[PDB]
Design a protein around this nucleic acid. Structure first.
Ligand SMILES: [Mg+2]
Ligand SMILES: [Mg+2]
Ligand SMILES: [Mg+2]
Lengths: 125, 125
DNA sequence: AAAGCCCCTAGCTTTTAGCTATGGGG
DNA sequence: AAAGCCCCTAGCTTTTAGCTATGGGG
DNA sequence: TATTAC
DNA sequence: TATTAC
């Protein structure tokens, strides 16, 4: 349930959602497939656990467990920036029709780190 | 329910728990009272919302909403570091009987950012 | 109007392009 | 053993301090 | 150099 | 420079 780095015991899960620039419906077909693949690789390299990843034509939603000392924002900027650069190189229509693949924004909402019965042991007695 | 900085919309809540060095039972009386005041001041200054804060003789538990761009660790570092400094200056026994007031560790667990009814609106159609 | 659109600086990128920053101007 | 105990180095606040770091050694 | 909401 | 778990 809980993982630890050298100094912290944690379980930090977040729903993360972001969309393409201008809300263009470009997360389809081959682009959707490659995007997921790039996110999985970024996560693997960043010691981030992807619990769920869903895409629709105009947004991607990820539920991930991320070390708090690392920072959810660090994972997000790498996932977004790397996917943008790679996808725009691989799918020219993404590079020629848009100034960037993503926007400067995202949505983030924490999720319970573990069921109540488990967390209780650590926060109450 | 959701707050925003210049680029992110969020609601990140965390249970945070840490204990005194050697698990000494020093969080009592005046020490406990002053510790809470200090942490409330830290939260105010760092734009952190303290939902709940409780102390037992050997640990403190805080439920807080923190901007993810700022980082839960930056709040923890300040809350622990400043309270150690001030409390050790104010209560001489905390300085003479211990090398530090706290340890290098803490426990962190995310809590749902908003009621499920509200979250679904942002993560699913 | 803002997260989302336009503009800016400055730190890092298995990305030297294209994302961040409790970042700033509309 | 590790989060928790001992040890260590940078960075940054709280500065003849005392905490972090996806930090390191036992 | 112009989007409309997951 | 020595803790035992919230
Ligand atoms: Mg250590
Ligand atoms: Mg802006
Ligand atoms: Mg038009």
């Amino acid at each position: 349930l809980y993982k630890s780095n050298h100094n912290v015991v944690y379980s930090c899960k977040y729903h993360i959602v972001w969309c393409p620039k201008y809300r263009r419906k470009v997360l389809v077909g081959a682009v959707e497939m490659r995007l997921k693949e790039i996110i999985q690789e970024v996560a693997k390299e960043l010691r981030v656990e992807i619990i769920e990843m869903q895409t629709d034509k105009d947004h991607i939603h990820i539920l991930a467990d991320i070390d708090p000392s690392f920072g959810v924002m660090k994972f997000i900027k790498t996932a977004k920036g790397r996917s943008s650069r790679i996808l725009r190189q691989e799918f020219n229509h993404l590079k020629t029709k848009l100034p960037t693949l993503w926007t400067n924004s995202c949505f983030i909402s924490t999720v319970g780190g573990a069921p109540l019965n488990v967390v209780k042991q650590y926060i109450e007695n």
